[PDB]
Amino acid sequence: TVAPEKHGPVEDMNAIINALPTKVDAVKLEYSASKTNRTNKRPGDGGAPPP
């Protein structure tokens, strides 16, 4: 005659879910590193000026 109430499991959530931002900081650092240009846009140049 009443709507059943559903909640979380018996075990606490935090022990399983945990919290450690090392992965996301690693991703952000990798993205910031890749933001700078790493390829060459002057092929067949020889960018050494004459002495």
């Binding site: 090392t22 992965k23 900081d25 690693a26 991703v27 952000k28 650092l29 990798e30 590193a33």
Partner: protein, 51 residues
């Protein structure tokens, strides 16, 4: 990701690892860095053996 691939991105986890101890030891605007050697001039001289 890639397991057998020789990737440099594995060190980004170590880069992201940063706590209060790491902040106390490394880091800082005035902190010196390696891979850059300060150069200073020296005197002009010569040497030779003599009887």
């Amino acid at each position: 990701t890639c397991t057998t691939g020789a990737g440099v991105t594995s060190g980004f986890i170590d880069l992201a690892t940063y706590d209060n101890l790491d902040r106390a030891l490394y880091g800082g605007k005035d902190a010196t860095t390696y891979f850059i050697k300060e150069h200073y001039p020296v005197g002009w001289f010569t040497k030779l053996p003599t009887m």
